[PDB]
Amino acid sequence: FKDLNLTDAQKQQIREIMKGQRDQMKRPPLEERRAMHDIIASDTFDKAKAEAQIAKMEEQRKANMLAHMETQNKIYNILTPEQKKQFNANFEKRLT
Amino acid sequence: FKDLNLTDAQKQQIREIMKGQRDQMKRPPLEERRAMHDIIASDTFDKAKAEAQIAKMEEQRKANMLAHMETQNKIYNILTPEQKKQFNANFEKRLT
């Protein structure tokens, strides 16, 4: 989400960045999915199992949030000042 | 995503359950939103500032994941066995 009258140069640059995003971003193994699922799809809610499962994903979610932040920053520093202006502006508005 | 063939009863019960969701789910303060933003919208990317910020939310993301999990489970235990059956069925086909 970012609608700032881009540029052919940038449109592509932020695409090359996106690519190196899909690679620093270790999404979750079917195993985990199945485990989450299984804890939910159960006669009763084993909380300890649930917490154990959410804790085993901590490190990963952390690394991903970080990668997402770097990436968003790299794109940001491809913007021009009036674009950074529009960018920030949209956000301050998107708080509503 | 789970269309299944409910019941006026179930449809409503899960609305009630959902209502008990919006109140166990501590949404994130404008402050933190602003802080994420600021770290990203910056001449340069301060990693320590980024990790500290992601760390500071640890407690909340966890509590929220947990709640989402209980809630999906209470919903589940309201279904009937052929719905529990479709439910699971969908999922296994949903990994693809």
- The arrangement of helices and strands of chain A along the chain is HHHHH
Count of extended strands of chain A = 0
Instruction: Name the largest protein-protein interface in this structure.
Output: A-B, 33 and 32 residues
In quaternary terms, these chains amount to homodimer
Overall outline of chain A? elongated
| Beta fraction of chain A | under 5%
CATH architecture label name of chain A: Up-down Bundle
Number of helices of chain A: 5
As a whole number of angstroms, the C-alpha radius of gyration of chain A is: 19 Å
Helix content of chain A: 55-70%
The CATH class label of chain A is Mainly Alpha
Whole-number tally of structural domains of chain A: 1
What would the CATH topology of chain A be? Four Helix Bundle (Hemerythrin (Met), subunit A)
The end-to-end span of chain A amounts to 16 Å
**For the report, how would you describe the main beta sheet of chain A?**
none
Would you tell me the structural class of the helices and strands of chain A? Answer: mainly alpha
Please tell me about this protein's structure:
Two copies of one chain form a homodimer. The first copy, chain A, is mainly alpha-helical and 96 residues long. Chain A has one domain: Four Helix Bundle (Hemerythrin (Met), subunit A) (Up-down Bundle), CATH 1.20.120.1490. Chain A is built from five helices and no strands. Chain A has helices at residues 8-19, 30-40, 47-55, 58-76, 81-93. The first copy, chain A, starts with 7 loop residues before the first helix and ends with a helix. Chains A and B meet through helix 2, helix 3, helix 4 and helix 5 of A and helix 2, helix 3 and helix 4 of B.
